[PDB]
C-alpha cells in the first residue's frame, strides 16, 4: 500500500526520505515502525522528506512509515498549571499524567482584526524601570532583548513571581496565568528555574513547556506554538495569560537546521526565506479580545539574544519589527551597577500609558522627562569643571532618579510601593541625599511604609492616584524619615 | 554481515552490504589491515549503501575491500581498571602496558540524563585563583568553561586547576584530550606519574586518560570526547562517585564534524559550520552532567576561532555552562596572567544568597571600577588626564592596581613567569580587594600589585621596589 | 579663555565630523559582512 504507508529510502541528519505516503497532507504527523513520530514538511513529487522526532538510530532504509491522519495538537486548559511538560504536552516533572480534557492544535491562525480591542489593562511586572517607563498592557507583545547574560530571563521570572499578588486575590479579572517556554536551554537551568518558581509559590499559576538542548530540532521548533495554544485556551475563555518564549533565537536555529537539511534555499545567515513568517505567525496569536469574544487576553514576552549588541542582525531585526516594543538590556550598564540593565533611552512601549495606571502616570511622567534630560547632559558630568547650576541640577536629579530604578531580583513590587518610592526622588526629597545611599534609603523607607503605613498605600492603591491628602501625608512621612535617616 | 568498500574520499568511506544493513552509529571493522580500522556508520544513502566516518587513516584502502558489521556502536572498556591508563577513541590502550581487563564494556553513544534526574545543589568550589574565585566562582558538580583564542591560557589554566583541585580531590578524574597537542598528553602523563596521581605499580591511580589528538583524522576527533565522557559516566552512575572531568579542547569535537560535513553532502550553515552544530553539541553536552546518582565537575577548554566570541561554536556553548572564564589576548598582551576578562566572566553562583554579600559586594565593586575605567580609557587617551575630577583620577588609580592585583603567578607557569606560583585562599582574596577598593593602598605603586599572591606580598614588594 | 574657546570649538567640530565618517564606515562594513557571509554560504551550497 503506497497510499497510506511508505518505505524509508534513506535516513540521515534527522531527515527521513519516504517513498509512498501518497495521501499525506503538508505538516502531517506520521509514524515510523520503531514508534518514532515524524512530521511531513516536504511533499515532493517522488518522496516525502520527513522530520524525525527523535534519534534516527531507530530508523533504517526500508522501515515502514504509516500516516496518522492527525495534525499536531496538544493538551490544554487548567490542569496543566504547576506542571512541567515537553513540547508535545507530555509531563516531564514525573508527577503523573496531566488530566487534560481539551486538546488544541498547535498552529492556528491569530485572531483577526475584528475580534480585538485596544490593549488597555496593565500587565505589571513589579520592576520599576519597566512598569514606569516601558509599560506592558495585556494582549501586548513586548520583546526582552540583549546579549548573553544581561538579565533577560530574570525580567520574565520577576514578572511571573509578581502575579501572585493578583492570583491569591478574589478579583478574577486581574489574575494572569503564566506560561514559560524554554527552548534550547540545558536541563539544569530549567530545573533551577522551576525551583526558584516553586520556592516563590508561582508554579501554582505557571505551566512550563520545555524543549531543551538535547531534544530533536522539530520539538525545539514546535515548543513555542504548543505553548501558545495552551495560553490561547485562557485567552479565549475570558481569562488572561502571560507567555515567555525563552529564546526565539534558539528556535530560529532549530528551524534553520531542518530547512537546510531538507535542502530549502538559504538566505542571509543561512536562514530560510520563511523565518520571518515563523515568528510573525507565532507572535500575532497574542492579543486583547473584545467583550464580544470574552475580553480575555494573551500577553507575550519573547526573548531574543543579540550578539555584541547587533540589534540589526537578521532574527533580532524580524522580531523587533513584529512586537510592540523592546526592553533593551546592556552589559556596560549591568557592570556599571545598573541592574536590571535596562537601557531606558532605547527601550520602548508602543502601547505606552494606554497601559499605565493613573497613580503611576502621576509620577512616571516627570521621571521619564528628567531622565531624558539627564541623558542629554550625563556625559558632561565627568569633566564638568564648571557647569552652571541649571544643568548641574539635572545631573543631580539624573543620578538619584537612576538609583531609584535599580532593583534586586526575585522581589517584584506592588504598584503602590513603586509610586511611593518614585515620588520620593521625583519630588526632590533625595536630592540632598548621597547617591551612595539611595539604595539603602528606599529599602528602609519602603520597609517602614509597608510596616507602619499600609493605610496610605491602600489609599493610593484604591483611589488609584495620589490624592492631595495622601500627597501631604507622604510629604511628612518622607521628611521625617529622611531626618531620621541622616542622624 | 559483511559489506564491501565502494568509495573512499578522505575520512568518509561508503560501504555496500548485500544482506543486512548495519544501523546508524554501528561500528564496522575493515578487514585486511595491520591495524584496527573502525568505521562509524553515519547515514543510509539507500541501495543498501551506508556512508561512514573512518576512526583512522584511510590510506591503502581499496574499492571492494571487505568490512564486517560489528553489530554495535563503538564500545570501550569502562570500570576502575581504566584508571592510570591511556586509551584510544576505540578503547585500545596506547600506553604499551597491556590490555585493559575490565569486567564491562560500554558504547560511547548513549542518551542524556532525563529532566527528573537533574540536581540543583550549588556549592562554591574554591580554586586558589584570585580572579576566578572573586568574580566567577566555580561550583562543585557544575559545568565550567574556559573560553580563549589561540595561545591565551586555556590549557595552563586547566593545568593549575588540576594541581589546585584535582590533586586533593577524593574521587576519580578523567582527562580527555580532544584534538589537542600530542606533546601535551606526554607532558601531563609524566607529570601525573611524577606526582603519584597515576601509579604504574599499584592500583592507587586516581585518573584515567583518553586521547584523540590533532594528528588524528576528523573521525577520531569527532569521537574521543565521547569515549572520555563515557569513561566518566561510569564512575558517576555505576560507582556513584564524585568525578572531575577535564576536556581540552571541546571545540575540537565541533571542528571535527565541520571537517567531514561537506563530504556528508550538506549545505553549510553560517561561518562554514555544519547545519547540525547545535544539536550535535546538545546531545553531547547533555551527558556531561551531575545527576542524583553521581556528580561530575567538568572543566572544558573552549577554543575561539579568529578570537571571535560570536563564532557559531564558542557562541553555541555558553548555554551549556554554569560558570565561564573568558580569557582575552588583549589582557594577555599586557602581561596580565591569567588573562581572564573580569567583565566577561560569569558564574551562576555569583549570588549574595550563595557566596554572601561581602563576597558579592566586593566582586561587583571591583567590576564597577574596571568598567568605569574601561569607559574612560579611550577618552583620557586623546583628551589626556588633567581635566579629570580628582574623584575620577582615583578610580583610574585603583582600577590600574586592581587590574594587576588580579594577575597571579601560577605554579605551572614558573617556566613562563620566572615567579614562584602562589595559591590564594578565598578570604585572602576578598580582603585584598576590599582594601584596595577602600583606599587602603592608594600610596603603594601599581607595580607592587603585579604578579603577587596575597595582598601582603604587594606591600612587601612596594618596599623592595622602594629601591 | 578665547583660545580655549576656539580650540574647543574646533575639537568639537572635528569630533562630530569623525563621528559622521565612522558611522558611514560602520554601515558600509555592516553591509559587506552580511553580503560576504552570504555569498560564502551560497558558493558552498551550489558546489554540491
Amino acid at each position: 500500500d503506497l497510499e497510506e504507508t511508505g518505505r524509508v529510502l534513506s535516513i540521515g541528519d534527522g531527515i527521513a526520505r519516504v517513498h509512498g505516503l501518497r495521501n499525506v497532507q503538508a505538516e502531517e504527523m506520521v509514524e515510523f515502525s520503531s514508534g518514532l513520530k515524524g512530521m511531513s514538511l516536504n511533499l515532493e513529487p517522488d518522496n516525502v522528506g520527513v522530520v524525525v522526532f527523535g534519534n534516527d538510530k531507530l530508523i533504517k532504509e526500508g522501515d515502514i512509515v504509516k500516516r496518522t491522519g492527525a495534525i499536531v495538537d496538544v493538551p490544554v486548559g487548567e490542569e496543566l498549571l504547576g506542571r512541567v511538560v515537553d513540547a508535545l504536552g507530555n509531563a516531564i516533572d514525573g508527577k503523573g499524567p496531566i488530566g487534560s480534557k481539551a486538546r488544541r492544535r498547535v498552529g492556528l491562525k491569530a485572531p483577526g482584526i475584528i475580534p480585538r480591542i485596544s490593549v488597555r489593562e496593565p500587565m505589571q511586572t513589579g520592576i520599576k524601570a519597566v512598569d514606569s517607563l516601558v509599560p506592558i498592557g495585556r494582549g501586548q507583545r513586548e520583546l526582552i532583548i540583549g546579549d548573553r547574560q544581561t538579565g533577560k530571563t530574570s525580567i520574565a521570572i520577576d514578572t511571573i513571581i509578581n502575579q501572585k499578588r493578583f492570583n491569591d486575590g478574589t478579583d478574577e479579572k486581574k489574575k494572569l496565568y503564566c506560561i514559560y517556554v524554554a527552548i534550547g536551554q540545558k536541563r539544569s537551568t530549567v530545573a533551577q528555574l522551576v525551583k526558584r518558581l516553586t520556592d516563590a509559590d508561582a508554579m501554582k499559576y505557571t505551566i512550563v513547556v520545555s524543549a531543551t538542548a538535547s531534544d530533536a530540532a522539530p520539538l525545539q521548533y514546535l515548543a513555542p506554538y504548543s505553548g501558545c495554544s495552551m495560553g490561547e485556551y485562557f485567552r479565549d475563555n475570558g481569562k488572561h495569560a502571560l507567555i515567555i518564549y525563552d529564546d526565539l533565537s534558539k528556535q530560529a536555529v532549530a528551524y534553520r537546521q531542518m530547512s537546510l537539511l531538507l535542502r530549502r534555499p538559504p538566505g542571509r545567515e543561512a536562514y530560510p526565506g520563511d523565518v520571518f513568517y515563523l515568528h510573525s505567525r507565532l507572535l500575532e496569536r497574542a492579543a486583547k479580545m473584545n467583550d464580544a469574544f470574552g475580553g480575555g487576553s494573551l500577553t507575550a514576552l519573547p526573548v531574543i539574544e543579540t550578539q555584541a549588541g547587533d540589534v540589526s542582525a537578521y532574527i533580532p531585526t524580524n522580531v523587533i519589527s513584529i512586537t510592540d516594543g523592546q526592553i533593551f538590556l546592556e552589559t556596560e550598564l549591568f557592570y556599571k551597577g545598573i541592574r536590571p540593565a535596562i537601557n531606558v533611552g532605547l527601550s520602548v512601549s508602543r502601547v505606552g500609558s494606554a497601559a499605565q495606571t493613573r497613580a503611576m502616570k502621576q509620577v512616571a511622567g516627570t521621571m521619564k522627562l528628567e531622565l531624558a534630560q539627564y541623558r542629554e547632559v550625563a556625559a558632561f558630568a565627568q569633566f564638568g569643571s564648571d557647569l552652571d547650576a541649571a544643568t548641574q541640577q539635572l545631573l543631580s536629579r539624573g543620578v538619584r532618579l537612576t538609583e531609584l530604578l535599580k532593583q534586586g531580583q526575585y522581589s517584584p513590587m506592588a504598584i503602590e510601593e513603586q509610586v511611593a518610592v518614585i515620588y520620593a526622588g521625583v519630588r526632590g526629597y533625595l536630592d540632598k541625599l548621597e547617591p551612595s545611599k539611595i539604595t539603602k534609603f528606599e529599602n528602609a523607607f519602603l520597609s517602614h511604609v509597608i510596616s507602619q503605613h499600609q493605610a496610605l498605600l491602600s489609599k493610593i492603591r484604591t483611589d488609584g492616584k495620589i490624592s492631595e491628602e495622601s500627597d501631604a501625608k507622604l510629604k511628612e512621612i518622607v521628611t521625617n524619615f529622611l531626618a531620621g535617616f541622616e542622624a | 554481515t559483511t559489506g564491501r568498500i565502494v568509495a573512499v574520499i578522505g575520512a568518509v568511506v561508503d560501504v555496500q552490504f548485500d544482506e543486512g544493513l548495519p544501523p546508524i552509529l554501528n561500528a564496522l571493522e575493515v578487514q585486511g589491515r595491520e591495524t584496527r580500522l573502525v568505521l562509524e556508520v553515519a547515514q543510509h544513502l539507500g541501495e543498501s549503501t551506508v556512508r561512514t566516518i573512518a576512526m583512522d587513516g584511510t590510506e591503502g584502502l581499496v574499492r571492494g575491500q571487505k568490512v564486517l558489521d560489528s553489530g554495535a556502536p563503538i564500545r570501550i572498556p569502562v570500570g576502575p581498571e581504566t584508571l592510570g591508563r591511556i586509551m584510544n577513541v576505540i578503547g585500545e590502550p596506547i600506553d604499551e602496558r597491556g590490555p585493559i581487563k575490565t569486567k564491562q564494556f560500554a558504547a560511547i553513544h548513549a542518551e542524556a540524563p532525563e529532566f527528573v534526574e537533574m540536581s540543583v545543589e550549588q556549592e562554591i568550589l574554591v580554586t586558589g585563583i584570585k580572579v576566578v574565585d572573586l568574580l566567577a566562582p566555580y561550583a562543585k558538580g557544575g559545568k565550567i568553561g574556559l573560553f580563549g583564542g589561540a595561545g591565551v591560557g586555556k590549557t595552563v589554566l586547566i593545568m593549575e586547576l588540576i594541581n589546585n583541585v584535582a590533586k586533593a580531590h577524593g574521587g576519580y578524574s578523567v582527562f580527555a584530550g580532544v584534538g589537542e597537542r600530542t606533546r601535551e598528553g606526554n607532558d601531563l602523563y609524566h607529570e601525573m606519574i611524577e606526582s603519584g596521581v597515576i601509579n604504574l605499580k599499584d592500583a592507587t591511580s586516581k585518573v584515567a586518560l583518553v586521547y584523540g589528538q590533532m594528528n588524528e583524522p576528523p573521525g577520531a576527533r569527532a569521537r574521543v570526547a565521547l569515549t572520555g565522557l563515557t569513561v566518566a559516566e561510569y564512575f558517576r552512575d555505576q560507582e556513584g562517585q564524585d568525578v572531575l572531568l577535564f576536556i581540552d579542547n571541546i571545540f575540537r569535537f565541533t571542528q571535527a564534524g565541520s571537517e567531514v560535513s561537506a563530504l556528508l553532502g550538506r549545505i553549510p550553515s553560517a561561518v562554514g559550520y555544519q547545519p547540525t552544530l547545535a544539536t550535535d553539541m546538545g546531545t553531547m553536552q547533555e551527558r556531561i552532567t551531575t545527576t542524583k546518582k553521581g556528580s561530575i565537575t567538568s572543566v572544558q577548554a573552549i577554543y575561539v576561532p579568529a578570537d571571535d566570541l560570536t563564532d557559531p561554536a564558542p557562541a553555541t556553548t555558553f548555554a551549556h555552562l554554569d560558570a565561564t572564564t573568558v580569557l582575552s589576548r588583549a589582557i594577555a598582551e599586557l602581561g596580565i596572567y591569567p588573562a581572564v576578562d573580569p567583565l566577561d566572566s560569569t558564574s551562576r553562583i555569583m549570588d549574595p544568597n550563595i557566596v554572601g554579600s561581602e563576597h558579592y559586594d566586593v566582586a561587583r565593586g571591583v567590576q564597577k571600577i574596571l568598567q568605569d575605567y574601561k569607559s574612560l580609557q579611550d577618552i583620557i587617551a586623546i583628551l589626556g588626564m588633567d581635566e579629570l575630577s580628582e574623584e575620577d583620577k582615583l578610580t583610574v588609580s585603583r582600577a590600574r592596581k586592581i587590574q594587576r592585583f588580579l594577575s597571579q603567578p601560577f605554579q605551572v607557569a614558573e617556566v613562563f613567569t620566572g615567579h614562584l606560583g602562589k595559591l590564594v585562599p578565598l578570604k585572602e582574596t576578598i580582603k585584598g580587594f576590599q582594601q584596595i577598593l577602600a583606599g587602603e593602598y592608594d600610596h603603594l605603586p601599581e607595580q607592587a600589585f603585579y604578579m603577587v599572591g596575597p595582598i601582603e606580598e604587594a606591600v612587601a614588594k612596594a618596599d623592595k621596589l622602594a629601591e | 579663555q578665547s583660545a580655549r574657546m576656539t580650540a574647543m570649538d574646533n575639537a568639537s567640530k572635528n569630533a562630530s565630523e569623525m563621528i559622521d565618517k565612522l558611522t558611514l564606515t560602520f554601515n558600509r562594513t555592516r553591509q559587506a559582512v552580511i553580503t560576504k557571509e552570504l555569498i560564502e554560504i551560497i558558493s558552498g551550497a551550489a558546489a554540491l
Partner: peptide, 25 residues
C-alpha cells in the same frame, strides 16, 4: 575595520565631542 572597534571608537568620540562642546561654552 571591525564593527567592534568602529563601535569602540564611536563610543569614545561621542563623549569627547560632548565634553569638548561643554568646555567651549
Amino acid at each position: 575595520a571591525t564593527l567592534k572597534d568602529i563601535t569602540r571608537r564611536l563610543k569614545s568620540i561621542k563623549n569627547i565631542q560632548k565634553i569638548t562642546k561643554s568646555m567651549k561654552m
